[PDB]
Ligand binder design. Sequence first.
Ligand code: M1I
Length: 121
Amino acid sequence: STEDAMTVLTPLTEKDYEGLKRVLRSLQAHKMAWPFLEPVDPNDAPDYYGVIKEPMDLATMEERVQRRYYEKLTEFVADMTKIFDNCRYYNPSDSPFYQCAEVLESFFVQKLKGFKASRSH
Ligand SMILES: COc1cc(-c2cn(C)c(=O)c(C)c2C)ccc1C1(N2CCN(C)CC2)CC1
């Protein structure tokens, strides 16, 4: 209800998408976001799609944001987390992609905390 506190389960409104779009754009503009901007190209990693069952990337999240796919903030955070978890599953810790996931994930958490602090019904 309008009287209850905001949480990760609060239904997202059209208004909340202004902040989600801002957060997503900030990730897309980060210099270390290059491994995640688009789906992994099978030619760059021929075994990838036989290992990673649920791929995710920032362009797919942008499409989902445009379609208002996310009903609760938990679902948005889950897709973002899948990007980084897939990266850390598939790649060794010394991979440049893994290093990009470590910086971009804590940047996402910084931005998400700001989104949450600013949110009202
Ligand atoms: C080696 O460069 C990349 C690697 C990945 C990648 C990302 N993530 C998360 C992975 O887990 C794996 C396994 C990979 C391979 C993404 C993009 C590129 C870039 N392009 C290379 C040439 N290609 C034709 C277009 C993309 C942008 C430099």
